[PDB]
């Protein structure tokens, strides 16, 4: 409603690096707010893409950013009779970035791992890995729960049970307010998907440089499934946390599986022990229900509500039966132990192939009225197909069905304006939360300040 | 003097297209006086079989390894009944596996690239996305011999990249060999799930499908490892633009899935890929074998001084003034057009000529106009 469309702030990165693929806010001990940007195709020291992370301070005029250095060298280590090898070429570092307190977690899902034992091996597979950084103290650590040293013949004999070789850990990441990092692995358990949880302090305290295989004493992983509905469901495409029980001591996880039950899609609400509490099923096949999930209280009653996005939803029109426009579903949390029934609200896109609902960002109380608001991105919306971001306000019975404000892409075509959004954080100390939008096709980030 | 229209050639229309005459009369000598008009009739009738193009898409993964005989037996029988239905048939084929990129593809040991088939005992071909093998041709023996030489490859997961094959067969016209005036049929053979849009992010691919043709001189889809899988709406739009009719030849374990996909892609059909002859597929194809076309008239080399008016007579005797075309005609049906020619003044040139011709047919009526 009050985001300023005229005075924008622009941040740019190296050409071809996909700067703006993922982004987040970061805060120092002194309280200043900066932006963390991931560029998963940045060139390494040998003119090979490895990815990168940039730490952009807040200037009104924008500009270039300094890069947060990591280690980009492949490692080989001899342990008894085995050799452990890590391969970081085209690992996609910066595909997902998150921040908690003074810790940046930047995760590379396409890092490859191998174990060689004489004439056998465990096969070169994308286990994924990801890096924890403390820039102020210059501390560095790594976390990779899906590495192993079991050869492929054992996996063949087991009928591929408990197979975490293609995890791609770091596809999606979240951090609870207690300080525990949760990672989604959509390819875990032979592309069924899994979740890996571990305390950040334990990760920093259990890391020794040189040992490529180690185990964190406090990590918990989800369980393999025998149900055919979960096959190829990509459990871990998107993750989120929230309070969905009434007990403030326990935390609840929301996980999206956009291909669950033969490309139908689902969103599951579990507790901290990976036991199901609820499951919302998709409405149409192949619409990627579960691509984006968000948790925020828009009704203004204290109970968190759920937003789900299906960017490939095809609505029934008059002149086009298959109008692939996208959809957003709003479920309101009821009183007591009642379950989440039918969706409270449906929002549908207007532009064809716009992929409406591919990113939902809770904006907080943008206009300071008493109810939370959201922002939905259509990366190929608008009459020209450049991109669009629509702001939806909250009211006593949910969200407003009409957008209060529409922001158009300031970049050329094909820039993917809205692939990543971040709100709910005030960056210029004026009292109203601001918004940052990442267009990786142009390798840029746009900052909108609310009034 | 009285204007007249003497019929010169009045060969009756043929009954079977096995020379064939489709326009009667064939030549008329019109004679006119200044500022006068004269009317005459023409009869058009379709007695020639309709063209058909059929393109096959074959799954050549490890799961579809012992089902190769089933999909090569369908192609020896599907190319036989169409030779009894229509005399103008083109048949071609291509193959698909999946994107040749990890994690869909084995990449270790360095001997697993030359054959993904290595940790087992046997050997099988390297990985590829989609390759065009046989362009649409009227030779059947060549088609069968070419199909018999196809072997399988091996990849990791169960869903396959068979929709990139569908788009690349649809939008590459000069490479597949689609004809402008024909009925286009695309048979898609599989036995497992399929990869859909936004599924390629697990390989590092985020660029959406653009719906253009990326098959080069090596007959290989080049952007397989660069752009994402196509979605349902883009596939539907392109199938509608190119006038392609899509048939799903799938095994019994996956029939219901592709039956649920057909409601989301209107104009598509689903059969079963059995062992004997896939009789459901053949019956469906012969059911589509009812293809009834239109008849439209055009004027060629009309002198400026002359003006023409048309009255159409389609099925039954429903005469439509001011019409020179009929729709909804079945192969064998006949329609009649009454054409009136009026001359303005008296041209200096004594003799002229023009032609009335059905659109898309060699047969035509030549009118030689003489001014008296």
């Amino acid at each position, epitope marked *: 409603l009050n985001l300023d469309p005229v005075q924008l702030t622009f941040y740019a990165g190296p050409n071809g690096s996909q700067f703006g693929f993922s982004l987040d806010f970061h805060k120092d001990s002194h309280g200043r707010v900066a932006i963390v940007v991931g560029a998963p195709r940045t060139l390494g020291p040998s003119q090979e893409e490895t990815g990168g992370v940039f730490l952009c301070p807040w200037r009104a005029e924008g500009g270039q950013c300094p890069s947060l250095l990591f280690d980009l060298r492949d490692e080989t280590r001899n342990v008894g009779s085995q050799t452990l090898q890590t391969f970081k070429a085209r690992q996609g570092l910066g595909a997902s970035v998150v921040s908690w307190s003074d810790v940046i977690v930047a995760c590379a899902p396409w890092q490859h791992w191998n174990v060689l034992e004489k004439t056998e091996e465990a096969e070169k597979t994308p286990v994924g890995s990801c890096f924890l950084a403390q820039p102020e103290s210059g501390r560095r650590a790594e976390y990779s729960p899906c590495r192993g040293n079991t050869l492929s013949r054992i996996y063949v*004999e087991n*009928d*591929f049970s408990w197979d975490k070789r293609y995890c791609e850990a770091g596809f999606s990441s979240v951090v609870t307010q207690a300080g525990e990092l949760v990672l989604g692995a959509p390819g875990g358990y*032979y*592309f*069924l998907g899994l979740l890996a949880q571990a305390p950040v302090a334990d990760i920093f305290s259990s890391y020794r440089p040189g040992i490529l295989l180690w185990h964190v004493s406090s990590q918990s992983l989800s369980f393999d499934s*025998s*149900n*055919p509905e979960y*096959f*190829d469901g990509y459990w871990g495409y998107s993750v989120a946390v929230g309070e969905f029980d009434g007990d403030l001591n326990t935390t609840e996880y929301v996980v999206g599986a956009p291909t669950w039950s033969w490309t139908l899609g689902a969103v599951e609400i579990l507790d901290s022990y990976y036991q199901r509490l609820h499951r919302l099923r998709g409405e149409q096949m192949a619409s990627y229900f579960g691509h984006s999930v968000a948790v925020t209280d828009v009704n203004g009653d204290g109970r968190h509500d759920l937003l789900v996005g299906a960017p490939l939803y095809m609505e029934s029109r008059a002149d086009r039966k298959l109008a692939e426009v996208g959809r957003v579903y709003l479920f309101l949390q009821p009183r007591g132990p009642h379950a989440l029934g039918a969706p409270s609200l449906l929002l549908t896109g207007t532009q064809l192939y716009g992929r409406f609902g591919s990113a939902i960002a809770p904006l907080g109380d943008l206009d300071r009225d008493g109810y939370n608001d959201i922002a939905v991105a259509a990366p190929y919306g608008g009459p020209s197909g450049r991109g669009q971001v629509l702001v939806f306000l909250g009211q006593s019975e949910g969200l407003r069905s009409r957008p209060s404000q529409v922001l158009d892409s300031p970049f050329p075509t094909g820039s993917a304006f809205g692939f990543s959004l971040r709100g709910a954080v005030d960056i210029d100390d004026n009292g109203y939360p601001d918004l940052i939008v990442g267009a990786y096709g142009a390798n840029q980030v746009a900052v909108y300040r609310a009034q | 003097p009285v204007s007249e229209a003497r019929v010169l050639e009045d060969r009756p229309l043929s009954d079977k297209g096995s020379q064939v005459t489709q326009v009667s009369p064939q030549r008329i000598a019109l004679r006119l006086r200044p500022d006068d008009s004269k009317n005459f009739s023409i009869q058009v009738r379709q007695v020639e079989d309709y063209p058909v193009d059929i393109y096959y898409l074959m799954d050549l*993964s*490890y*799961s*579809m*390894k*012992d*089902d*190769l*005989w*089933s999909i090569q037996n369908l192609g020896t029988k599907l190319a036989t009944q169409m030779r009894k239905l229509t005399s103008n048939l083109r048949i071609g084929f291509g193959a698909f596996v999946d994107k040749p990129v990890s994690p869909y593809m084995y990449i270790s040991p360095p001997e697993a690239l030359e054959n993904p088939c290595y940790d087992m005992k046997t050997t099988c071909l390297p990985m590829f996305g989609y390759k065009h093998v046989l362009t649409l041709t009227d030779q059947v023996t060549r088609f069968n011999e070419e199909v018999k030489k196809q072997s399988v490859s*091996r*990849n*990791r*997961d*169960a869903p396959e990249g068979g929709f990139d094959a569908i788009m690349q067969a649809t939008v590459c016209d000069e490479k597949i060999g689609w004809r402008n005036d024909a009925s286009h049929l695309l048979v898609f053979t599989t*036995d*497992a799930k399929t990869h859909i849009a936004l599924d390629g992010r697990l390989a590092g691919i985020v660029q959406p499908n653009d719906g253009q043709c990326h098959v080069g001189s090596d007959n290989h889809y080049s952007a397989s490892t660069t752009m994402d899988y196509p979605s349902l709406g883009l596939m539907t739009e392109k199938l509608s633009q190119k006038n392609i009719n899509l048939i799903f030849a799938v095994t019994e*374990n996956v029939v219901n899935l592709y039956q649920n996909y057909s409601e989301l892609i209107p104009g598509t059909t689903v059969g079963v890929l*059995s*062992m*004997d002859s896939s009789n459901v597929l053949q019956l469906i194809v012969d059911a589509y074998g009812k293809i009834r076309s239109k008849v439209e008239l055009e004027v060629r080399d009309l002198p400026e001084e002359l003006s023409l008016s048309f009255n159409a007579t389609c099925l039954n005797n429903e005469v439509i003034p001011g019409l020179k075309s009929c729709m909804g005609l079945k192969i064998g049906d006949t329609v009649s057009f009454s054409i009136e020619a009026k001359v303005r003044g008296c041209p200096q040139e004594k003799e002229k000529s023009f032609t009335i011709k059905p659109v898309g047919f060699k047969d035509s009526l030549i009118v030689q106009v003489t001014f008296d």
Partner: antibody
Amino acid sequence: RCSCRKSGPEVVKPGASVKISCKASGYSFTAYFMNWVKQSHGKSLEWIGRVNPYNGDTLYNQRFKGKATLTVDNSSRTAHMELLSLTSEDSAIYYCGRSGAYYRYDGRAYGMDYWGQGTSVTVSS
Amino acid sequence: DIQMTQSPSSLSASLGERVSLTCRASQEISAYLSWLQQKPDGTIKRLIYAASTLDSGVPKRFSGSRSGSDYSLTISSLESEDFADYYCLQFATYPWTFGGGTKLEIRR
């Protein structure tokens, strides 16, 4: 590894009904078909039918369509078969076999592996 | 349905001999065939599937190689353990059908 444990011998009357089980362990049990086979006194194995544990869809041999009902119990990972209107011709040994239904990799089911132990049913008054 | 015909109904051999059993199909089955051995006990085990592929743990002495019409199972250097009954299963079209049965006998 994979175990298929069946119930004990049954002696029934000529006209009654019997219900035999095959408890499965060591695998998923929901991604595999459950086939039942009848071997008479003079060898000659016959296929009775199969049941889908995920959804209780049964495919029957035409000869045994109205004679055996194939059910499942996912809670205890146990398959069942019930024979109705027993006569002197159904006294034989019945086997439970496991076959592949849903695959997570580029592969296909190649028959019935991992058979059971054999349950002998004798029908006599 | 498809009827499978097993040529040797009974086979008698000595230790160390080489024997072969043939199973032919009435209709066309491409490579959908498996070989089963039933020991005196009632226990049934699958030895070869896909008409040529050994199972895990079967010695590299049992072999099978053919497709199309005929199918064969061969034992070279016949040992004392493998004197049992053998069957072929088609599983190409429903209903699944079995072979007649071949029982191996020791010649002494």
